[PDB]
Design a protein around this nucleic acid. Structure first.
Ligand code: SF4
Lengths: 26, 374, 132, 1124
DNA sequence: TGTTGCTGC
DNA sequence: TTTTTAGCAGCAACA
C-alpha cells in the first residue's frame, strides 16, 4: 500500500534518434 | 490543489510531436485545403513524412530515458474524499487530473525534398492505341486521376504538380503516364514548328489554339498529341500565367541540347564546332537563341579540351570512389564547370565541390586552369 | 499508405477560447517528466480493494481502479509533488522552447486527431526526499 | 685481441633489414597514393620570389618520417599537398655530430687521430666554428673550434659513438687521445636534425625542389586531409574486462569527413541494423550507413578495405593506443591477417600504433596533456559534456554483451555516439591545435601529440640555437649523490610559488562586509595617483598623455573617492569581488630580468669576462631560496654504512650474466647509492628519531645582461607573435560580424582561419608557459635549477607586495602564486575611460593600474643590455619590465572552506559565481570525479547553485543550510523513503580498478574486496559498484564493501552471500536498508557539509547554520576563544 | 601531536 | 628511454 516510489536515475539521458515506420505508429 | 491519479491501462495511440513555430503557423490556418497528412511509400520499409499543403518534413522518433506522464483533468463521477497525510502546503482540492499516457519518445520534423513514388507508373512512348497496351500488360495498380496519385505520393500538392510537370507526366486515354524523352521532344519540335508556322504569341499560348494547330491535318485515332499532351508540354517547357503560357527559351535550348547529345553524339567525341553546326540546324526556323558549349559540357564530358561527348548521370555509380574512378577514366584530366554537374549526385552534404572532388580524385592547378587527376 | 491529421476541433476550440493563462490549458491538460522509473504495482484491482476506507489511496472511479499517487502544489514558478507517504519532489514550471503537441491515432477508422498543444512542463530533476 | 671481425657483419645485416622495412613502407605508401615524386632538373637561377617559375611541385607537408634509401639516411615527406590527393618526396642528408678539443692549437693532431680511429664508419670530416655560451669571452665573437664528423647513415654514427665513449671514460677517470674533451650534438634525432637544418615543418607549406624545400607563405590555411575517426565494441565476461584472446569485436563505428559508418558482426549482433541518423546537435550531423557482416573476419576485412579505399591521412580514436588498435591487431592475428600488410599500421617501441602515410591522432593524449581538464573529467562522456556541450548516449559496460542479443539497435546507437563524439572532438579541438604546433615545432603530428610539453620547448630552443649558430649543450645528468654540511641529500629544490588562505566564508556582492582601510595607504595612493594614471596611458595603453582630453576629470573623480575612504576609513558596505592575476607571470619575470640558463654566471666566468670593469652595470644580482632535504646522518656515519654494505652480497640484475651474485663495489654506482639510502633511512630513524631534515637557504646568483640573446629573444618574440594573433583574432571577430548574414557566401573560410589564429594563439601560449617549466625539466638540456628559484622568489615577492597593498585598502581572501582573490569596498575607484582627441576610448582599471605602477617602480630592470651593433659589439642599456596584473570580475559570490585545525585555512579550494549566477570557477571539490559516492555528487549538484540565493552572507548560508538539512533527513530517516533501486544508486559508491590480474592478487581493500566478491558471486578497468554494510560490527570498511549486483540476484544467492559477507548465519532479513551502514554515510555527508559550508560561515565568525553537523573541537575552541 | 606516504589538485 | 616546476588538502599509519 506504501510501495510506490521512483528509482532515481543519476543523470538525464536522451537516446538516439530513430526512423519511424508505419508499424511504429500502429 | 489538484489530486494526481493513474489508470491501470494507458492508451498507446497518444504520441508527442514537436511543433516548430512554422508548424504552429500552419496549424493555426483554417484556410488550407489539406491541413496535414502522414505519408509513406509502403508500410514496412520506407520512411514516414508529414506534409502540409505545400511543404514536407520527414519524421524522426527520439527516445528518452525518462518516465513522461501526460495528465488530463477529470471530474470524479462520485465525490471522493482523501485522508490527509503528513503533507505540507496543501490547498483545497478544486479539480482532478489523471495520468492517462506514458510516452517515451518525441517526433521531430526535418525539412526534406518531397519526391514522387513512381513505382507502378509505366513509361509512355507515344504508341498508337495505348489503351489496349495497358491490358497487354498486367498493371493491377489503378491511377484514374492525378489527385489520386498525389494522394498516394509522399509529397504536397504543389510539390507534386511541380515534380510531375518536371518529369513530363501526362495522361493518355484516361490512363496516367510518363512520356518518353524522345517522343516528348518530338512533340515539342512539331509544336514549335506549328506555333511559328502560325505566328502565335509564344509568350501568350493557350491549350486550345495550339492543340488545334498540331492535330489539324492528322486523324484523331493516330494523333497522340491530345489536349493533355499539350498541357504537359506547356507545363514542362513554359510557365503559366486567365492563365496563359510563356516559353522558357534558355531552358528549351538546354533541353534541345540534351536531346542532341543523346541522339547524335552519344558514341563518339565530336569536335564542338561541327556539333554546334548540326545542333543549330536541327531547330525550327527563326527560333531565337544563342549557345555555349559551356553548358554543353556542363551536360556531357570532354575527352580532350576541345571536344565534347554525352554522358548520362543516371549511369554513374553510387559508390563515391568508384564513380570518381570512372570519371577519371573518361578523361585523365577534367575541367571544372564540366565536372561539377557530374559530382552533384554523390553527397548531399552541401559542401564545397572541391571538397568531395579531392576526397576521391584530386585537383591540380596551373596558370589559369585547374584540372582534376588523382 | 497515407492519412490526414484532423485538427479542426482543437483549432475551433482554440480560436473560440482565450489564450492559455496558467500551466494548465482550458481543456485541462498537463505533462510530467521524471528522471527515473516510477515503480508501481503490477496488479491493481486486487490491491485497490484491500486499501482501508479512511486512506482512499486506491480509489475506484467508474469501474476503473485509480491510484492516488500524489498531490501537486504550485507556488508561482516553484512546484511540489508529494508521492505516497515517503516521497517529496521539488520542481519547476518551465516554458517549452518547442510547443509540444499531443495527437491520437484512431487505428479503427484510420483517423488521426490533434488532441492539444502544450506550452509548459513541470520538471523534477533532484533526488526525491521524504514528505516532511 | 679476439673479436674485430664480428661487429662489421651485424651492421651490414641491420642496414639490409632497415632497407627491407623501407621497401615495405614504400609499397604501402604507394598503395595509399603516396608515390615518390622526384622533381624535374632545373639549371636556372634559384630565387624564392619567382616560385611559380621554380620547378617541381608545391605542397603542404602533412607527415614526415626517417627512412633508409638505396643504405643512405633520408626523410620521407608526405604532402597532403594543394590540389592533389597526396605525394611523397625524400630529402637525403648526412647524419653528423661534433668532437670538442681542450687545446685549440692541436686540433690537427686530433683530426689525424679520429680519421685513423673511425675509418670503418666515418664518411667525412670537417673543422667548423660555433658559438659556445660556456666559453670565456664568446660575447667578443670568440667561437669554439669543433671537428664535425659526418656519416652515410645513423647506424655508422652510433658505431662511432661506441668507439669514442671508452676514450672519454679513460680521459675522465685516469697523447692526442687526451685532447678529446667531449662529443657534442650526438643525441639529436635524425628527422629532427633534417627538419631543423632544412627549416621544413609539418603544418607549413613547401615547394619540393632539387636544392631542398622552400617554405611558402601565400597559403596560411591548412589543406583538408581525409579524416577517419573510429571506436570499437567488444564482447566481455560479466564483471571482467574484454580479453582479445577470447572476446570478439561486435561492432566498429566510424566517421569519415562527416559521413558515418557502422560495421556489425552478425555472429554476435542478433538483428540486421538499418541506416539511421545520430545528430546530437544541428552543428554535429551523423548519418550512419550500416555494413552487416557475417562474422568477425568479414568485419575486419571490410574495415581494412574501407581504409584502403578512402586513404585517410589521419585516423583518430579515443584511447585507441591502449585498447582499440591492440584489440584489432590481436583479433587480426588470431584470424591470420597481418594488419601491417593490410593498412600499414604497427605498434612502435612504446607500444603505440603508427603508420607511414597516416598519422594516429589519439584524442585521449590531447585530453591528458592540453585540454586543461582535471583527471576526473578525462573520460569520453565528460570530455563531450565539457567541450562539445551535449550528453552522449551512455550504456553500462555489463549490458553491452547482453544487448548485442536483446537490444542491438540500442547498442549500435551507443557505438555511433562514441564515434560522433570522437570525430567532432578531433575536428573542433585536436586537429587545429596539433597541426598549428607542427608549423613551429620540428616534429610530425604523432610526436607533436604525444611528447611531453618540456620536450616541445627543447625542440623550439634547438631551432633558435641552431639559427644563431650556437652549439647545443649535452643533456644534464643529475649527480647520483650530493652533500650539504657533510649530510647526504635525499633531494634538493627551491621555494616555489607562494600560496595563502587568509579568510574563509561566503562573500557576496549583495551582502555587507566590514572594511578597515589604512589611511596611510590612501595617502600613498593619492601621492602616486598622477604618475599611476600617466603610466596607464603611456605604458598599459601605449599612448601619450597629450592626446587625452579628460585626464584631469578622471584624476579628480578618483581623488574624491580616495579622500572619502581616507576620512571614513572604517566602513560596513557591499563588496566588489575581484581577481587580480599577473599576465603570464613567470615568462614576464624571465623576459624582464633577462633570465635564461645561458647567463647564470659564476664569480669565475664573470671575472674572466672582458666587459668586467670598475662601474659595470651588466651584472644583475638576484636572490633565490634553495631548499635541501637531507639525512640527519653525518659523513662519518655515511662511511660506516658504506663499509657495512661492502660486507653484504647482492643479486645480479643482469639476466644475461651467469654470475648470480655481486659484491657492493661490483654494483653500479646508482645501485650502491640506492642501498646506502635504504640503510641511512633506517639508521637516521633509529639514532635521530627522524628520517629527514629540511633547510631553506637564501642564495644569490649573477644574471649576465651582456650574454648572447637567443633564449630571451625567443621568449620576447614568441610573446609578441602571440599578442599579434590575439590582435588578429580581434580584427577577425570584427570581420565575422561587420559583413552580411548569408553564412554560405564563401566566408566559412574566414571562420576556420579564426579558429586557426586562435589556435596559433593558444599554441604560442602553451609554448611560453612551458619554457617557463621546461627550465626545471630534469634530464632536459638548457636545464637551470637556479634561474627557476629566482623566477619563483621574484614572483613570491611581487604577489606579497600586491597583497600588502590590497590588505590595507580591502580584504584579500586567497592568494595563489600569480593571483589574488579580494573584496574591495563598493565605493572604491573602479573602471574609467580616457577619451583621446580622435574619440577612441582607452580602458582604465584603477585597482589594476595602482598595482602595475608599483610593480614598475620596484621590479623594473634598469640594467637590461641589448646588442645594437653586432660588428662592433656595442650594447645599449635600457629599462625593461613586462609584468602586468590583469583584472577579472566583479563576481557575484565567492565561497572559501576552512580547516578542522585551529588557525589554518584551506589553500587552492574555492567556488566563484558570475553576475548571472553561472558557476565561473571552482577549486578542489568532488562530483566532477569518476566514481565516488553518488549521494555526495547529487548533494554537490544541488548545493552550488543555492550559494547565489540570499541578500546577506548569513541569509546565503541559511538557504544553503535548508538543502543541507533536507539531505540529512534522507539519511536520518534511513532513506526508508523514495524507491529501493534509487536508494541503491545514490548510496552506491563506484570505483574503477586500473589493471586487475596480478596488481590485484596484490593489494587488498574495499574495491579489491568488491572485485573479489563479484568474482566469488558471478581484467582491466572493472567498475566496482558497492555499498558499505553495518555488519560485521567493528570490522574495517574494506571488509564491509558489498557489490550492489547482489541486491538484484535470486533470493537464495542473495541470502547465502549476504550471510557470508556480514558474518551472520542467522540473517533472514534481506532489505537493503537493514544491511546499509547509515552511520558511515551520515559521516561522509557530514564531512562534505563541514568542508563546504559549516566551515566557511564559522571560519568567518558567523554562527553555525547546520547545527545537526557539529564543528571540530579545535574550531569550537577557536570560536570560544574569539568571543571571550 | 607531528611526520610521511600517496593521489591530485 | 623519455621525462616542465613547487605548494597544498587530506586520509591513514606510525614515530
Ligand atoms: S657581468 Fe659583464 S663582465 Fe661579468 S660575465 Fe657578465 S658580461 Fe661578462
Amino acid at each position: 500500500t506504501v510501495k510506490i516510489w521512483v528509482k532515481y536515475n543519476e543523470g538525464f539521458s536522451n537516446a538516439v534518434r530513430k526512423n519511424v515506420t508505419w508499424n511504429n505508429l500502429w | 490543489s489538484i489530486n494526481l491519479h493513474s489508470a491501470p491501462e494507458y492508451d498507446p495511440s497518444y504520441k508527442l510531436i514537436q511543433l516548430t513555430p512554422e508548424l504552429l503557423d500552419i496549424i493555426q490556418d483554417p484556410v488550407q485545403n489539406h491541413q496535414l497528412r502522414f505519408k509513406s511509400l509502403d508500410k514496412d520499409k520506407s520512411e514516414v513524412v508529414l506534409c502540409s499543403h505545400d511543404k514536407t518534413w520527414v519524421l524522426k522518433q527520439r527516445k528518452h530515458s525518462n518516465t513522461v506522464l501526460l495528465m488530463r483533468e477529470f471530474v470524479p463521477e462520485q465525490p471522493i474524499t482523501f485522508d490527509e497525510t503528513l503533507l505540507f502546503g496543501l490547498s483545497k482540492p478544486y479539480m482532478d487530473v489523471v495520468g492517462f499516457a506514458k510516452t517515451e519518445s518525441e517526433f521531430e520534423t526535418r525539412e526534406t525534398h518531397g519526391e514522387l513514388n513512381l513505382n507502378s507508373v509505366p513509361i509512355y512512348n507515344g504508341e498508337l492505341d495505348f489503351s489496349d497496351k495497358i491490358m497487354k500488360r498486367s498493371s493491377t495498380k489503378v491511377i484514374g486521376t492525378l489527385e489520386e496519385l498525389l494522394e498516394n505520393s509522399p509529397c504536397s500538392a504543389l510539390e507534386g504538380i511541380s515534380k510531375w510537370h518536371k518529369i513530363g507526366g501526362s495522361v493518355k486515354d484516361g490512363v496516367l503516364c510518363i512520356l518518353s524523352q524522345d517522343f516528348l521532344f518530338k512533340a515539342l519540335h512539331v509544336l514549335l514548328m506549328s506555333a511559328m508556322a502560325e505566328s502565335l504569341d509564344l509568350q501568350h499560348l493557350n491549350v486550345e489554339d495550339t492543340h488545334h494547330a498540331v492535330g489539324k491535318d492528322i486523324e484523331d485515332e493516330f494523333n497522340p498529341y491530345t489536349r493533355e499532351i499539350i498541357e504537359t508540354v506547356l507545363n514542362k517547357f513554359a510557365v503559366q500565367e486567365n492563365n496563359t503560357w510563356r516559353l522558357r527559351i534558355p531552358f528549351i535550348a538546354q533541353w534541345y541540347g540534351i536531346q542532341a547529345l543523346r541522339k547524335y553524339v552519344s558514341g563518339i567525341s565530336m569536335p564542338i564546332d561541327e556539333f554546334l553546326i548540326k545542333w543549330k540546324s536541327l531547330f525550327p526556323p527563326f527560333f531565337p537563341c544563342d549557345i555555349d558549349i559551356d553548358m554543353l559540357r556542363g551536360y556531357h564530358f570532354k575527352p580532350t579540351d576541345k571536344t565534347v561527348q554525352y554522358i548520362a548521370k543516371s549511369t554513374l555509380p553510387m559508390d563515391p570512389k568508384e564513380r570518381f574512378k570512372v570519371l577519371f577514366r573518361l578523361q585523365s584530366q577534367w575541367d571544372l564547370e564540366d565536372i561539377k554537374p557530374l559530382i552533384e549526385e554523390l553527397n548531399s552534404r552541401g559542401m564545397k565541390i572541391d571538397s568531395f572532388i579531392m576526397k576521391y580524385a584530386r585537383r591540380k592547378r596551373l596558370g589559369k586552369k585547374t584540372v582534376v587527376t588523382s | 499508405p497515407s492519412v490526414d491529421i484532423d485538427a479542426s476541433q482543437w483549432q475551433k476550440l482554440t480560436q473560440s477560447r482565450e489564450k492559455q493563462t496558467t500551466v494548465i490549458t482550458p481543456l485541462g491538460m498537463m505533462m510530467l517528466e521524471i528522471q527515473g522509473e516510477l515503480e508501481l504495482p503490477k496488479d491493481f484491482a486486487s490491491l485497490a480493494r484491500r486499501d482501508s476506507p479512511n486512506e482512499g489511496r486506491f480509489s475506484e472511479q467508474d469501474g476503473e481502479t485509480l491510484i492516488r499517487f500524489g498531490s501537486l502544489q504550485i507556488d508561482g514558478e516553484r512546484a511540489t509533488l508529494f508521492v505516497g507517504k515517503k516521497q517529496r519532489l521539488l520542481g519547476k514550471v518551465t516554458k517549452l522552447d518547442v510547443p509540444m503537441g499531443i495527437m491520437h491515432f484512431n487505428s479503427k477508422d484510420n483517423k488521426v486527431e490533434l488532441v492539444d498543444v502544450m506550452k509548459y512542463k513541470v520538471i523534477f530533476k533532484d533526488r526525491p526526499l521524504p514528505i516532511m | 685481441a679476439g673479436n674485430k671481425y664480428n661487429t662489421l657483419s651485424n651492421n651490414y645485416a641491420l642496414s639490409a633489414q632497415q632497407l627491407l622495412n623501407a621497401s615495405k613502407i614504400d609499397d604501402i605508401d604507394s598503395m595509399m597514393g603516396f608515390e615518390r615524386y622526384v622533381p624535374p632538373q632545373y639549371n636556372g637561377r634559384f630565387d624564392a620570389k619567382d616560385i611559380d617559375q621554380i620547378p617541381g611541385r608545391v605542397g603542404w607537408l602533412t607527415n614526415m618520417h626517417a627512412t633508409l634509401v638505396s643504405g643512405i639516411s633520408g626523410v620521407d615527406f608526405y604532402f597532403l599537398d594543394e590540389e592533389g590527393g597526396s605525394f611523397k618526396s625524400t630529402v637525403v642528408y648526412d647524419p653528423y655530430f661534433f668532437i670538442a678539443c681542450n687545446d685549440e692549437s692541436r686540433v690537427n693532431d686530433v683530426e689525424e687521430l679520429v680519421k685513423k680511429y673511425l675509418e670503418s664508419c666515418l664518411k667525412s670530416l670537417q673543422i667548423i666554428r660555433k658559438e659556445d655560451l660556456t666559453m670565456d669571452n664568446h660575447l667578443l665573437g670568440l667561437q669554439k673550434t669543433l671537428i664535425k664528423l659526418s656519416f652515410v647513415n645513423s647506424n655508422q654514427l652510433f658505431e662511432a659513438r661506441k668507439l669514442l665513449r671508452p676514450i672519454l671514460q679513460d680521459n675522465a677517470n685516469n697523447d692526442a687521445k687526451h685532447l678529446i674533451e667531449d662529443i657534442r650534438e650526438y643525441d639529436v634525432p635524425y628527422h629532427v636534425r633534417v627538419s631543423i637544418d632544412k627549416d621544413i615543418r609539418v603544418g607549413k607549406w613547401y615547394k619540393v625542389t632539387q636544392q631542398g624545400f622552400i617554405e611558402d607563405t601565400r597559403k596560411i590555411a591548412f589543406a583538408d586531409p581525409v579524416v577517419m575517426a573510429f571506436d570499437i565494441e567488444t564482447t566481455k565476461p560479466p564483471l571482467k574486462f574484454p580479453d582479445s584472446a577470447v572476446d570478439q569485436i561486435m561492432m566498429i563505428s566510424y566517421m569519415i569527413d562527416g559521413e558515418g559508418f557502422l560495421i556489425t558482426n552478425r555472429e554476435i549482433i542478433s538483428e540486421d541494423i538499418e541506416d539511421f541518423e545520430y545528430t546530437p546537435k544541428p552543428e554535429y550531423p551523423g548519418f550512419f550507413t550500416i555494413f552487416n557482416e557475417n562474422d568477425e573476419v568479414a568485419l575486419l576485412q571490410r574495415f581494412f578495405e574501407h581504409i584502403r579505399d578512402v586513404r585517410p591521412t589521419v585516423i583518430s580514436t579515443f584511447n585507441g593506443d591502449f585498447f582499440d588498435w591492440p584489440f584489432i591487431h590481436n583479433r587480426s592475428k588470431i584470424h591470420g591477417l597481418d594488419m601491417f600488410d593490410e593498412i600499414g599500421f604497427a605498434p612502435d617501441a612504446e607500444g603505440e600504433y603508427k603508420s607511414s602515410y597516416c598519422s594516429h591522432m589519439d584524442c585521449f593524449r590531447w585530453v591528458k596533456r592540453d585540454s586543461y581538464l582535471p583527471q576526473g573529467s578525462q573520460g569520453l562522456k565528460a570530455v563531450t559534456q565539457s567541450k562539445l556541450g551535449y550528453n552522449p548516449i551512455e550504456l553500462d559496460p555489463e549490458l553491452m554483451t547482453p544487448y548485442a542479443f536483446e537490444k542491438p539497435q540500442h547498442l549500435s546507437e551507443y557505438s555511433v555516439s562514441d564515434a560522433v563524439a570522437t570525430y567532432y572532438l578531433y575536428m573542433k579541438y585536436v586537429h587545429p591545435f596539433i597541426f598549428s604546433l607542427c608549423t613551429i615545432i620540428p616534429l610530425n603530428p604523432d610526436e607533436t601529440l604525444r611528447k611531453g610539453t618540456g620536450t616541445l620547448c627543447e625542440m623550439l630552443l634547438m631551432v633558435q640555437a641552431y639559427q644563431h649558430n650556437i652549439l647545443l649543450p649535452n643533456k644534464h645528468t643529475d649527480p647520483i649523490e650530493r652533500f650539504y654540511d657533510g649530510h647526504l641529500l635525499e633531494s634538493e629544490t627551491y621555494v616555489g610559488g607562494h600560496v595563502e588562505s587568509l579568510e574563509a566564508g561566503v562573500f557576496r556582492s549583495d551582502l555587507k562586509n566590514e572594511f578597515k582601510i589604512d589611511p596611510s595607504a590612501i595617502d600613498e595612493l593619492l601621492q602616486e595617483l598622477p604618475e599611476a594614471l600617466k603610466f596607464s596611458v603611456e605604458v598599459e595603453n601605449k599612448s601619450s598623455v597629450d592626446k587625452v582630453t579628460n585626464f584631469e576629470e578622471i584624476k579628480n573623480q578618483i581623488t574624491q573617492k580616495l579622500l572619502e575612504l581616507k576620512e571614513n576609513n572604517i566602513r560596513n558596505e557591499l563588496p566588489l569581488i575581484y581577481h587580480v592575476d599577473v599576465a603570464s607571470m613567470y615568462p614576464n619575470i624571465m623576459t624582464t630580468n633577462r633570465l635564461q640558463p645561458d647567463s647564470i654566471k659564476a664569480e669565475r666566468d664573470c671575472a674572466s669576462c672582458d666587459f668586467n670593469r670598475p662601474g659595470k652595470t651588466c651584472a644583475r644580482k638576484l636572490k633565490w631560496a634553495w631548499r635541501g632535504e637531507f639525512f640527519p646522518s653525518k659523513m662519518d656515519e655515511y662511511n660506516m654504512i658504506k663499509r657495512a654494505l661492502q660486507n653484504e652480497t647482492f643479486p645480479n640484475k643482469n639476466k644475461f650474466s651467469k654470475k648470480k651474485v655481486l659484491t657492493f663495489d661490483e654494483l653500479s654506482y646508482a645501485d650502491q647509492v640506492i642501498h646506502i639510502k635504504k640503510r641511512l633511512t633506517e639508521y637516521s630513524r633509529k639514532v635521530y628519531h627522524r628520517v629527514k631534515v629540511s633547510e631553506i637557504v637564501e642564495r644569490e646568483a649573477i644574471v649576465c645582461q651582456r650574454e648572447n640573446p637567443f633564449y630571451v629573444d625567443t621568449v620576447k618574440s614568441f610573446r609578441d607573435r602571440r599578442y599579434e594573433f590575439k590582435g588578429l583574432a580581434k580584427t577577425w571577430k570584427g570581420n565575422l560580424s561587420k559583413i552580411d548574414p548569408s553564412d554560405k557566401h564563401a566566408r566559412d573560410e574566414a571562420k576556420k582561419m579564426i579558429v586557426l589564429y586562435d589556435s596559433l594563439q593558444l599554441a604560442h601560449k602553451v609554448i611560453l608557459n612551458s619554457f617557463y617549466g621546461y627550465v626545471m625539466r630534469k634530464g632536459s638540456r638548457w636545464y637551470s635549477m637556479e634561474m627557476a628559484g629566482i623566477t619563483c622568489l621574484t614572483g613570491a615577492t611581487i604577489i606579497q607586495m600586491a597583497r600588502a597593498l590590497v590588505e590595507r585598502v580591502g580584504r584579500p581572501l586567497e592568494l595563489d602564486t600569480d593571483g589574488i582573490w579580494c573584496i574591495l569596498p563598493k565605493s572604491f575607484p573602479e573602471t574609467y575611460f580616457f577619451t583621446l582627441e580622435n574619440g577612441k576610448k582607452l580602458y582604465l582599471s584603477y585597482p589594476c593600474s595602482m598595482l602595475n605602477y608599483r610593480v614598475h617602480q620596484k621590479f623594473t630592470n634598469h640594467q637590461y643590455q641589448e646588442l645594437k651593433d653586432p660588428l662592433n659589439y656595442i650594447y645599449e642599456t635600457h629599462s625593461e619590465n613586462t609584468i602586468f596584473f590583469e583584472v577579472d570580475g566583479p563576481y557575484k559570490a565567492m565561497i572559501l572552506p576552512s580547516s578542522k585545525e585551529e588557525g589554518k585555512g584551506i589553500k587552492k579550494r574555492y567556488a566563484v559565481f558570475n553576475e548571472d549566477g553561472s558557476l565561473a570557477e571552482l577549486k578542489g571539490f568532488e562530483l566532477k570525479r569518476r566514481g565516488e559516492l553518488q549521494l555526495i555528487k547529487n548533494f554537490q549538484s544541488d548545493i552550488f547553485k543555492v550559494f547565489l540565493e540570499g541578500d546577506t552572507l548569513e541569509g546565503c548560508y541559511s538557504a544553503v543550510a535548508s538543502v543541507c538539512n533536507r539531505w540529512l533527513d534522507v539519511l536520518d530517516s534511513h532513506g526508508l523513503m523514495l524507491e529501493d533501486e534509487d536508494l541503491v544508486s545514490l548510496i552506491c559508491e563506484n570505483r574503477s580498478m586500473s589493471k586487475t590480474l596480478k596488481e590485484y592478487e596484490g593489494q587488498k581493500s574495499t574495491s579489491i574486496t568488491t572485485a573479489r566478491r563479484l568474482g566469488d558471486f558471478l581484467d582491466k578497468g572493472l567498475q566496482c559498484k558497492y555499498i558499505i554494510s553495518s555488519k560485521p560490527f567493528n570490522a574495517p570498511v574494506t571488509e564491509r564493501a558489498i557489490p550492489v549486483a547482489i541486491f538484484s540476484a535470486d533470493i537464495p544467492i542473495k541470502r547465502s552471500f549476504l550471510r557470508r559477507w556480514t558474518l551472520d548465519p542467522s540473517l533472514e532479513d534481506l532489505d537493503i536498508r537493514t544491511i546499509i551502514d547509515w552511520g558511515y554515510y551520515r559521516e561522509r555527508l557530514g564531512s562534505a557539509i563541514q568542508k563546504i559550508i559549516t566551515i566557511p560561515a564559522a571560519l568567518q565568525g558567523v554562527s553555525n547554520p547546520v547545527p545537526r553537523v557539529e564543528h571540530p573541537d579545535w574550531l569550537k575552541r577557536k570560536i570560544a576563544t574569539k568571543e571571550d
